[PDB]
Amino acid sequence: MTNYRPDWNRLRGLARGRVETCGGCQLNRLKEVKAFVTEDIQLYHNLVMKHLPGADPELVLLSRNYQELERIPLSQMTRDEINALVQELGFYRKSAPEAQVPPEYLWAPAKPPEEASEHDDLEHHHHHH
């Protein structure tokens, strides 16, 4: 039944994610993995792929300013599972790279700024005809 859960306490700050993997290498053996890092990886906002000299295909949940907070391997899991995780976090997925993103997930997976949904000086709040 799996029933897995991340370390949200250790992940605190995750505002973006980047996948690191050997550019001059291929994930033929990891047919699944390769997929996630070829098709959807471009559709997933704030989720970009990386071509390192020679590293393993691992996700890097950074903290906005590229403050790598945590890195988890993907070679072990399957595309279907790896996608589940991304969704679990809050990442957005579109149909195309040139596609847009609704206000709901505009800043996703990050939260909207404080000074935006807060109001108290609405017409002095007294009386209105």
Curated annotation (Swiss-Prot):
GO annotation (BP), single: multicellular organism growth
Location relative to the cell: Cytoplasm, Perinuclear region; Endoplasmic reticulum; Golgi apparatus
Tissue specificity statement from the Swiss-Prot or TrEMBL entry: Widely expressed. Highly expressed in brain.
Keyword tags: Cytoplasm, Endoplasmic reticulum, Golgi apparatus, Selenocysteine, Signal
Cross-link (Cysteinyl-selenocysteine (Cys-Sec)): C22-C25
Stretches for region Disordered: 102-122
Predominant subcellular localization, coarse grouping: cytoplasm
GO CC annotation terms, alphabetical: endoplasmic reticulum; Golgi apparatus; perinuclear region of cytoplasm
List of catalytic residues: C22, C25
Function: May function as a thiol-disulfide oxidoreductase that participates in disulfide bond formation.
Family to which the UniProt record says this protein belongs: Belongs to the selenoprotein M/F family.
UniProt protein name: Selenoprotein M
Biological source species: Mus musculus (Mouse)
Gene: Selenom
